[PDB]
């Protein structure tokens, strides 16, 4: 009834129509938008959903000739083509644009929930996510909503992290390989939270860390929600937030290992309509900020410092241990990671790799369709 069309009027111009639903709500649709979004077999390929026409193919003077609501659907005929198409009621309501578009600068998407140290680490079973699609769905949904999740009871096997990535997507291969070794000896001698690779564009969007061996005390993994840090800055200091979102920083890795990577991106990235979409924060690979005008540099640095203070706040960190066979994924466009200090001697062997979020969301979409 929210989605059941009742009636329609076409404007005298034919430039738009106004659809009334059974609950009394109205939604206006332009002729050009309706024509471009026609769902019939000659606009959208039945076999693959690809649109068969370009914007150039649609006559510039396209108008609604006539329209009618009947049996839960809208019939519309366009001029000058003479093309008649029908739209289900549910589709029109779901794809409506005649609505109040939220414009709040720095807002998070409704699909994510921000967190601090009160958030327990989401934890899922390695075997369950492979054999139970509901478990797999919930695992990937946790990564989508919260930006991280643990996988426990996995195999103590080299390269197992690559198998984890392959459950939903594909590894971003780099000059270090499809995965890399993180070996640590801790002894008396003795042998900040960040996002990885802000000097890569596009940034690798997921990171996996997988434990094979751990005999050292302490050194718990920590995750910090970049969106929560940014939210706190926005609420306290909107001008400071605007500075970090409104000017690009520079990142560079120029090692002796034959990799020289640079990127020009802001530390807080917004969509053009103000939604917070990414965080880049890494002290080790920050490079000279050449793009910020002189008049803003002092205040930019003050805001940068303040963001760092929120990131350094121990009340923001979620900490956990990785036993052999355990791993975690972070959304590397949002959630920062680090570890706590070691409190005892021993050895550690982790493996690390990157994967991409587009594959994760596709797999999640496919699972939601299969389960719903």
Ligand X SMILES: C[N+](C)(C)CCP(=O)(O)O
Ligand Y SMILES: O=C(O)CCC(=O)C(=O)O
Cα separation of 166 and 159, whole Å? 11
- Beta-carbon-side half-sphere exposure of residue 154 (alpha carbons within 13 Å): 29
Cα–Cα distance, 341 to 141 (Å, whole number): 31
Least Å from the CB of residue 50 to ligand Y? 12
205 binds, among a second copy, ligand Y, ligand X, none (CB under 5 to 8 A by kind): a second copy
Tell me, rounded to whole angstroms, the distance of Cα 52 from its chain centroid.
Answer: 29
Q: In whole angstroms, what separates CA 188 from the centre of its chain?
A: 41
Give the C-alpha separation, 341 to 117, whole Å: 17
Considering only residues 312-371, where is the footprint of ligand Y by CB under 6 A? 337, 339, 350, 352
- According to the binding rule CB under 8 A, does residue 248 interact with a second copy? yes
Q: Which stretch binds a second copy (CB under 8 A): 1-9, 68-76, 186-194, 224-232?
A: 186-194
Binding partner of 176, given a second copy, ligand X, Fe ion, none, CB within 5-8 angstroms per partner class: ligand X
- 41 sits near a second copy (criterion: CB under 8 A): no
Q: Note whether 333 binds ligand X by CB under 6 A.
A: no
The reply on whether position 339 binds ligand X by CB under 6 A is no
Stretch near a second copy under the rule CB under 8 A, chosen from 112-120, 130-138, 228-236, 352-360: 352-360
Nearer to a second copy, 213 or 312 (CB): 312
Q: Which does 294 bind (CB under 5 to 8 A by kind): ligand Y, a second copy, Fe ion, none?
A: a second copy
Smallest gap from Cβ 307 to a second copy, in A, equals 8
Q: Should residue 286 be labelled a site residue for a second copy when binding is judged by CB under 8 A?
A: yes
* Residue with smaller CB distance to a second copy, 165 or 322: 165
Which range binds a second copy by CB under 8 A, 71-79, 113-121, 142-150, 295-303? 295-303
Query: Is residue 37 a contact residue for a second copy (CB under 8 A)?
Result: yes
Angle, CA of 282, 268 and 144, to the nearest 5°? 90
User: Can you tell me which of 108, 114, 197, 214 binds ligand X, judged by CB under 6 A?
Assistant: 197
Q: Alpha-carbon distance 211 to 351, whole Å? A: 7
Q: Which of 203, 222, 235, 233 is nearest to 308 (CA)?
A: 233
What's the token pair of residue 84? Answer: 């008649």
Stretch that binds ligand X, among 108-116, 143-151, 189-197, 216-224 (CB under 6 A): 189-197
Size of the site for ligand Y (CB under 6 A): 8
**Number of shown-chain residues binding ligand X (CB under 6 A):** 11
Q: Smallest gap, in angstroms, from Cβ of residue 10 to a second copy?
A: 15
Site string for a second copy, 73-112 (x = CB under 8 A): ----------------------xxxx--x-----------
Q: Is 194 in the site for ligand X (CB under 6 A)?
A: yes
Q: 296-307: buried (b, 16+ CB within 10 Å) or exposed (e) per residue?
A: eeeebeebbebb
The answer to the question of residue 248 lying near ligand Y (CB under 6 A) is no
- Report the site for ligand Y in 165-204 (rule: CB under 6 A): 182, 196
Q: Is 259 in the site for a second copy (CB under 8 A)?
A: yes
44-52, 134-142, 150-158, 208-216 -> range binding a second copy (CB under 8 A)? 44-52
Q: What is the nearest approach in angstroms of a second copy to the Cβ of residue 142? A: 19
Chain breaks in the chain (C to N over 2.5 A) after: 191
Footprint of ligand X (CB under 6 A): 176, 180, 190, 194, 196-197, 253, 282, 284-285, 352
């Amino acid at each position: 009834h929210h989605h059941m069309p009742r009636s329609v009027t076409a404007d005298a111009s034919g430039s738009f129509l106004t659809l009334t639903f059974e609950d009394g709500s109205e939604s206006r649709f332009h002729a050009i938008w309706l024509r471009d979004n026609a769902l019939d077999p000659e606009t959208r390929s039945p076999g693959n959903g690809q649109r068969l026409i370009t914007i150039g193919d649609i006559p510039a003077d396209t108008r609604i000739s006539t329209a009618l609501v009947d049996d839960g659907a809208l019939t519309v005929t366009f001029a000058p083509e003479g093309k008649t198409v029908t739209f289900p009621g549910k589709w029109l309501k779901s794809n409506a644009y005649d609505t109040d578009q939220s414009s709040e600068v720095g807002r998070t998407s409704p699909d994510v929930e921000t967190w601090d140290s009160s958030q327990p680490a989401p934890a899922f079973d390695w075997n369950e996510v492979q054999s139970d699609p509901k478990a797999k769905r919930d695992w990937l949904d946790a990564i989508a909503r919260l930006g991280f999740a643990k996988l426990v009871n996995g195999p103590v096997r080299e390269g197992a992290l690559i198998e984890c990535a392959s459950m939903f997507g594909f590894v971003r291969e780099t000059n270090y390989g499809k995965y890399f070794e993180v070996r640590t000896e801790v002894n008396p001698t003795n042998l900040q939270a960040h996002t990885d690779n802000p000097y890569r564009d596009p940034v690798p969007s997921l990171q996996i860390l997988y434990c094979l061996e751990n005999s050292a005390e302490g050194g718990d993994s920590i995750v910090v929600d970049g969106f929560r840090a940014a939210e706190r800055l926005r609420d306290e200091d909107p001008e400071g937030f605007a500075l970090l979102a409104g000017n690009p920083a520079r990142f560079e890795y120029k090692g002796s290992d034959g990799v020289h990577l640079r990127a020009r991106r802001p530390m807080i990235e917004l969509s053009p309509d103000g939604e917070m979409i990414a965080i880049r924060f890494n002290n080790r690979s920050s490079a000279p900020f050449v793009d910020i005008p002189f008049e803003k540099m002092e205040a930019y640095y003050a805001a940068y410092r303040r963001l760092g203070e929120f990131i350094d706040d121990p009340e923001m960190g979620v900490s956990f241990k990785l036993e052999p066979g355990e791993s975690f994924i972070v959304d590397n466009t949002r959630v920062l990671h680090a570890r706590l200090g070691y409190s005892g001697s021993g050895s550690r062997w982790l493996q690390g790799c990157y994967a991409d979020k587009d594959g994760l969301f596709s797999t999640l979409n496919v699972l939601n369709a299969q389960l719903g």
